[PDB]
Structure formats: C-alpha cells, structure tokens
C-alpha cells in the first residue's frame, strides 16, 4: 500500500481526486500539502496472506541452538549446512512446508514441490 | 526565525489565544497614543528536595517565540540523558573548551496548522456525526474560524498599515 | 520496592474481524473511560501521526500492520496538540475537584505517577512510556494478525512462588503502615488535647 | 521439551511411548505418560462431582 | 485572546550549535586498559547494603526499657501539656469604680471587643468581668460579628 | 523437584549500569527506522534500551554470571528471532541446575566442562569429613561447570538427557529400553540426572518408570500415611 | 522571579535593566556533544574542578574518519590515557546549546 506521510508536519496523507485533470492527489488534512500519487492503488485487503512466513530471520539465525539442522543443498551457493523451520503464521490453515536458511550466504529457500 | 526572538518560561494553557509579541508592541503604541482558621494540625509528607525543586523549576515549560508568532516551540524536560553529556566548544583557534551539560530540553512546534479547541474537539468526538469529515480543517479554514497566531497577528498588523 | 501496590494497564482491540473499523483503546488508572491510544500518545508529547506509528511499528514496509493502525489515528484526529489531549484525559478522571485549569496538570500527574509505574514515577520520562506503550500495541497487533499465538497462561516461566520471605514481607509492610498511622494519631491527639 | 529441536513432529517428540512397562519408559516418555495420567485423574474428580448432581 | 499569561522572563542566549555527537571509548590497545574492565566488573560485584544487626546482650537487659519500667522518661519532646500547664496565676477582683472606667476607654479604642481579648487586657476573672460587661455592653450573637461584645447604643451615641 | 530452587532476588541496578557501559544505547535516542536490527534489552520487564551487537553482550553477560560476578540466580534470555534480550532479577523464579556443554576442540566435539578431575575432588571433600581444600557445590558454580536455569531461559537452550550417548559424535541388548538419540550437535547443557524430575514422595518408589502413572501418584499420597520414625526425639 | 505576562502596560522597561530578547550572536559556534564513560564523567563533571587547565589533546587524522583523545599524565595511571572519539552522528541538525541566568532586577 506504501503509506505516505506529509513533508511539513509528518502527518498521514489521504487520497483526493482532482477533476480538473482527472488524477489522484495525496493531501494532508491539517497543513494543506499535496503530492501526486505514483501508483493508482490506495487500499488492499489480504484475506489469504503470506506476510510472516519467514519472519524473524536475522544475521545470526544459525547461532540458535534450538533450530534443527539439515543436509539439504542450497541452490544459490552449493552448501550443505542450514537451519530449517516451519511457517511462522499461527493461523490454523497453513501448510507444514519448511523454510531453509543457509549458514554461508543467508539465502532462504523452501521444500515446496507443489507451487513453490 | 523573525528576529527578535524570546525564550522564556510561561504557562502553556491556551497557547492559541495568547498575544503575540508584535501585537503587544502595537497595543503599547496605541496606549501611548491614547494617553497622549486551619485545623492547627496537619501532616506533611516527606518529599525528596531534589524532585520538588525539579517539579517547581519545570512547572512552566520553556516557550520559544519569534516576533510575529510564526514559530512557537514548547520545550519538554528530558531526564534519560540529562546529566551524562559534556560539551566541547570549538574556539576560534582550533582548540576545544569543555563544559559540563546540565539539562536536555525537547522542543515541539505549536500552532502551525490551526488546531481546534477542547470543547470543539469533544463535540466532534461525541456522536455529532458518524465520523469527522476528511477535509473538515479545510472547510473551517475558509469559514474564518480556527486561525493561527501568525495569521491572527498579520491581519491585525495589516489592519493598522492600511491606515 | 517502595509502595507494593499494583496498577493494571489494558490495551483493547475493539471490534471483530467482520467490522469495518477496529480501533485500539487503553485503560488508564483513575480515568473511568477507555481512551484512544493516539490521544495518550499526544498526551505524552508525540503529536505527529508518523512518529506515533514509528513508535508502534518498527518496520516501514509492514503495511499490513499500518493498515490496521489507520483507524486509530483517524479516531483521535480532532486533537492535535499536547495540552488539548491532556485536558481530554483529565475531564474523564474521577476527582471532580479539578475545576478546568488544574485539570490539565491532573492528567499529566496521572500519566507520570500512575501510568506504567514499573518503568519510573519521576518527572521527565515520557519517551520511555511512549515506547513501552507502542511495544504493547505492537504485540497486540501481532497476535491480532495471526503472527503470534495468545500467551500461554500455564507457562511456568511466567509464574512466581511466594515463600515465607515475601509473605512475611507484605504482612509486615501492612502492619508497619498501621503502626505509623497510630503513631501520628497519638501525636495529633497529644498536641490538641494538651497531654504529654 | 527442551530436549528436541524446534518444529519436530516425530512420534518420539509428541508423546509416543515405544517401550513397554517391562522394558521401562525413558525420561521423555515418563513425563509424557505422566501428562496423560494427570488427565485421567482430573477427569475422574470433575466427572464424579458433575454426575452426582445429575443423579440427584 | 487572553490578556494575562503569567510569563517568567530570564536571560537566555544561544551559545553554540551541535555538529558532532561523540562517544568516548577507552582504547583496548592502552596499557591501563582492563583496569576499567575490572572497575565495571566491580560495579556488579558490589554489595553496598549491609545486614541487620543482631543484639548479643542478655535478652532481659535489652527489655528493661520496654513496658512498665521503673525508669522514667527524661524526654522534653512534644511536652505540650507541660508548656502551658506550668503557667498559672490568680487575680483578685479590683474595685468596680476603676474597672468600669477602664472599659470605657477600651471601648473608645475599638467598637467591637472579643471575650478572650477582653479578659486578656483586663486580666481579671471572667465572673466579675461579665457583670460589668453586661452592664455596659451587649453581645450580638446572630449578626455577622457574632460572639463579640459592643458598647450599648445609649452611651455610644454621644 | 529434588533439585529445584526458588530465587530470592537481587538489585537490578548494577546490571542496568553494566549494560549502559557496554553499549546499551538509551531509549531516548532510539530511532526504529535508522536501526532495524537492534535488539531490545529488558530488565525485569522494563525496556531500558537497545544494543547493536547482542551476541557479544550475551557472551559477556554469561561469562560474568559463570565466573561469579553476576548472581547465578539472575536469568538471561536472548530471543534471537524476536530481537529481544530479557534479564530477570526478581524473586520468585523457580530454577534448577544443569551441566554446561562447550566445544572443547581438543576432542573435536562438544562435551561437558566438568571432568573426572573435578569429580575426584568432589568426592575427596565428601569423604574427608568422615584436610584437602574445601571444594563444594559453590566451587562448581563459580568455575562455570554448572548453571542455574529457569523455565523462561529453558526456552532458548538444548539439553542432553545423558552424557553417555548424546554428547559423543554419532549389538544392542534386546532387554534394554529403546533410547532415542536425537542426533543433535548443538547441545548447550546436560541433565545432572533425569531422576531428579521427581519429588520427595516419588523418589521412594522403586522403578517408577515401570509403573502406570496413576499408581505413582497414589503411592506419593500413601507414602505420607505410613508409620515409621518421624523423629528420634 | 514571577512577572506579568502580556505586558501591554510596558513594565519591563523599569522592572528589568537588561534586554529580554534571546541572544542569537554566538550561535555560529561549532560544538561537540560527547558522551563520556562513568569513570571519566565522574571527574570531568566536577564543579570543584575545571580551573582552566589542559585536560588533554584532541587529535584528528589529516584525512579524517578517525579521532582520538589523549589525556595528560594527570590521571595517576589509574585509567587509560588514550580514547577513541566515536562519531555516532557526523551531521547533526536541530540541536543547539543555550544558557540561562537571572536578570538584573532594579531600574
Ligand atoms: Zn501535513
Ligand atoms: Zn547457501
């Protein structure tokens, strides 16, 4: 959605329509600052969302002694050490697919063979 | 800023209906032209002297106002990093002079976008309507209500320059 | 250490998943009403909406969390400065001795000495209170977004066992308070009724 | 338990006792078996009180 | 607007603009380094608070100050009863012919006299003093100046 | 349980001061959008600041606790994923001891820090009472061989049931029970002995792992109704 | 030091014998905000000190990117003599230093 914030007061901008040009403008509700939008999308509802599948991956994820290790091959550096974990979305509708993080290039790949 | 600038301590209540320095100067000009038993026993609760001193000293926050009221910043006392800072002033010879720091104040601008009042705000918060109109501030700006100190002073100053 | 009393702060996500507007309201001690979180943030000195969101969400591209926060900033739009927000807090308080002008300070004191007391109770720590409040809101939103599961109440790591030490500690604290109260009452009675 | 790795779904991880009483339960099996036993003891107490009221 | 704001003026001056924020950190390649590490380790090691003190005296001796004790308190603290009870003196009723005149000069001084103030100035017993006061003055109880004697209008209106 | 203990709590101020000196940037200058990797530092549930290098801070904190500068009862947890560093000093937390496992590359695999030389002096002090220098449980604690761990810190550690088979890198008797190896090479601790999970009443049962669990519960209750010698006086 | 507010009566002309305006004259003065360790801040923030002596020297590489502080030999060889000034912020804006003292009250 790419929230936009005002330049002069840092408040949130809102979409407005200018019929003189039939375009989309983003204006502030208190200080009268306007800016033309770069994209025509203003709202998005994600009923089925995948944001958070790999949440929590950091530069030292391999230091975690509790994460299980695997021998799968990383298809970006050809290394065999890696830590894997299941999806981090706590909806009781997510698949049991695994996510692998390589301990040599920080690349994240998956075991999915259905859709990938 | 529009010089001169004043940095004093003052009450911040109703810091939208306080006379600007320029307005006061103009009013001074026209004024000159115009004239031309207790319970006998109570308990005090011990309070650390330092906090009471801090409470009394910081009761009236710093207010930084320019001449025309265009800039009005209110300072707030910060205690997280107040007494661990040190200042090095670069003299005009390459050298450094060290000065301990006393306090840190965080200043936030006031009255730049024509804020409402508490009574007006509460009427809108209550079910006057399902939700406040998106462009209410723009609408009320044209009616003339809810102006700023800067505009409230400029129109008065122009009301004098016109004569 | 110091007073042993407990004050609870609750941050509630009103509305269900089938609603068109779910706002967040926080319960403050001695206020009698659940205030929108934005109003509390402005009462702490953070007026810009962008800064408030920065205190809540720590990722600039987590639009899904920001989308759920937009109704909150919309609810408290009519208040746009520290003093008006404080007066909004104060008039909800249950004191009715504050008239209209001691009422801003009353809310300020409530936010200082009774709001999130376990961080501090001294003047000049609004930034810590705002950051912690954002931390609570962030965790609330993470669970509401099916990114975290509700905290397990039986997790033995969130429990404490009070032994004879703490048990006798609170008993002694209560009894010593009563003893001191009796001492002063005797002092007052001796001063007034003219005794030795 | 803090003896397996995160996201482990093998039978040994989620409470499958592979041994018999003759051979002896391992410490993980002993605790999981105890958890199941506690369920029965609680059920016995609660159902006894509730069925008694139903009978009356 | 508001005509009074109750400011507090002070002498202020901007005496510099911050250009760099610095963090002083001791160099690890310094000889005296690792003395700071020990100092920082002593910060957590320290036990500034001290334990309660146990009395090793005979228990009977320690309890000799408690309860019904043969010893008498020598304290002068909050002996309010002693302060005002000590002072006491009697006064004999003086002749009416003199006090009667004294009250009139007094009433000429002020047009309203309280009872406590009157007894203090006259320094006479309230018993006799009441007789003359009622004979000369009257007390208004229900008026705003309640419980205050004032000279009767017969002699005041002169 | 037999080896369970409850902390009495200490002052958190010394730890907060220690954190400030080692780069725990205060919370008054934290810009979340200019440091989207900083670890939030909590002490007794109070967000005191952030740290740019949590790994070194945790290493320094753990070493200090093990050598005996921070009280062993203090619990330190590093939620690497959540980017949080929680320190608990309050009283009322239940903890228990565990062996410490370190690499010790001399053999090339992780192994307990406690060796047979230590055990020799442990029993030497045990039997000299019935005079070598005293060597007690505290000596194990101060030498970094055992570690108090509470339920919250237990969430971030990997524990081996025995050092016999789990620690060594990796016919069978048909009568022995089937033991699962778990084939993990990242153990951080080891159980002193699994039997210590039981309490006072269940520690008198012989072969409680060859019984159905409710029978063990019944005996625990009934063993308190048995006549014996409650005291010698 | 309580005083009137708006002051349309022009009472500041006699109640105060000094200008009440903020002095924007020394603002163009470079200043470094330095955070000190506890052992160093406990002896540099002392008001029974700071007699104008040389606390040490500040050394900057000709090409920049590295600064170091060298204290004198007055520390009594109990603390390090060499420190590294770590620039947590090279460019700083909206931060200023302002003083505060009382005004002369008569005439
Ligand atoms: Zn704006
Ligand atoms: Zn790789």
From Swiss-Prot, chain A:
It holds the Pfam family Zn_ribbon_TFIIS. One of its GO terms (molecular function) is DNA-directed RNA polymerase activity. SUPFAM superfamilies: Zinc beta-ribbon (SSF57783). PROSITE patterns: RNA_POL_M_15KD (PS01030), ZF_TFIIS_1 (PS00466), ZF_TFIIS_2 (PS51133). The keyword Repeat does not apply. A zinc finger (TFIIS-type) spans 70-110. It comes from the Eukaryota. The modification Phosphoserine is found at residue 39. A zinc finger (C4-type) spans 6-31. One of its GO terms (biological process) is transcription by RNA polymerase II. Zn(2+) 2 binds at residues 74, 77, 102, 105. Its main location: nucleus. Zn(2+) 1 binds at residues 6, 9, 28, 31. The keyword Cell inner membrane does not apply. It is found in: Nucleus, Nucleolus. InterPro entries: DNA-dir_RNA_pol-M_15_CS (IPR019761), Rpa12/Rpb9/Rpc10/TFS (IPR012164), Zn_ribbon_RPB9 (IPR001529), Zn_ribbon_RPB9_C (IPR034012), Znf_TFIIS (IPR001222). Present with 2440 molecules/cell in log phase SD medium. Component of the RNA polymerase II (Pol II) complex consisting of 12 subunits. DNA-dependent RNA polymerase catalyzes the transcription of DNA into RNA using the four ribonucleoside triphosphates as substrates. Component of RNA polymerase II which synthesizes mRNA precursors and many functional non-coding RNAs. Pol II is the central component of the basal RNA polymerase II transcription machinery. It is composed of mobile elements that move relative to each other. RPB9 is part of the upper jaw surrounding the central large cleft and thought to grab the incoming DNA template. Involved in the regulation of transcription elongation. Belongs to the archaeal RpoM/eukaryotic RPA12/RPB9/RPC11 RNA polymerase family. This is DNA-directed RNA polymerase II subunit RPB9.
Curated annotation (Swiss-Prot), chain C:
It is found in: Nucleus. Coiled coil: none annotated. DNA-dependent RNA polymerase catalyzes the transcription of DNA into RNA using the four ribonucleoside triphosphates as substrates. Second largest component of RNA polymerases II which synthesizes mRNA precursors and many functional non-coding RNAs. Proposed to contribute to the polymerase catalytic activity and forms the polymerase active center together with the largest subunit. Pol II is the central component of the basal RNA polymerase II transcription machinery. Component of the RNA polymerase II (Pol II) complex consisting of 12 subunits. Belongs to the RNA polymerase beta chain family. The binding of ribonucleoside triphosphate to the RNA polymerase II transcribing complex probably involves a two-step mechanism. The initial binding seems to occur at the entry (E) site and involves a magnesium ion coordinated by three conserved aspartate residues of the two largest RNA Pol II subunits. Present with 18700 molecules/cell in log phase SD medium. This is DNA-directed RNA polymerase II subunit RPB2. The gene is RPB2. The chain holds residues 246 to 441 of 1224 of the full protein.
From Swiss-Prot, chain D:
The tandem 7 residues repeats in the C-terminal domain (CTD) can be highly phosphorylated. The phosphorylation activates Pol II. Phosphorylation occurs mainly at residues 'Ser-2' and 'Ser-5' of the heptapeptide repeat. The phosphorylated form of Pol II appears to carry, on average, one phosphate per repeat. The phosphorylation state is believed to result from the balanced action of site-specific CTD kinases and phosphatases, and a 'CTD code' that specifies the position of Pol II within the transcription cycle has been proposed. It is found in: Nucleus. It comes from the Eukaryota. Residues 27-39 are annotated as: Bridging helix. Signal peptide: none annotated. The C-terminal domain (CTD) serves as a platform for assembly of factors that regulate transcription initiation, elongation, termination and mRNA processing. Component of the RNA polymerase II (Pol II) complex consisting of 12 subunits. Interacts with DEF1; the interaction is direct and serves to bridge RPB1 to the Elongin complex in a DNA-damaged dependent manner. Interacts with the Elongin subunit ELA1. Interacts with the Elongin subunit ELC1. Interacts with ASK10. Interacts with ESS1. Interacts with RTT103. Interacts with SHE2. Belongs to the RNA polymerase beta' chain family. This is DNA-directed RNA polymerase II subunit RPB1.
UniProtKB/Swiss-Prot annotation, chain E:
It comes from the Eukaryota. It is found in: Nucleus. TFIIF is composed of three different subunits: TFG1/RAP74, TFG2/RAP30 and TAF14. Belongs to the TFIIF beta subunit family. TFIIF is a general transcription initiation factor that binds to RNA polymerase II. Its functions include the recruitment of RNA polymerase II to the promoter bound DNA-TBP-TFIIB complex, decreasing the affinity of RNA polymerase II for non-specific DNA, allowing for the subsequent recruitment of TFIIE and TFIIH, and facilitating RNA polymerase II elongation. Present with 520 molecules/cell in log phase SD medium. This is Transcription initiation factor IIF subunit beta. The gene is TFG2.
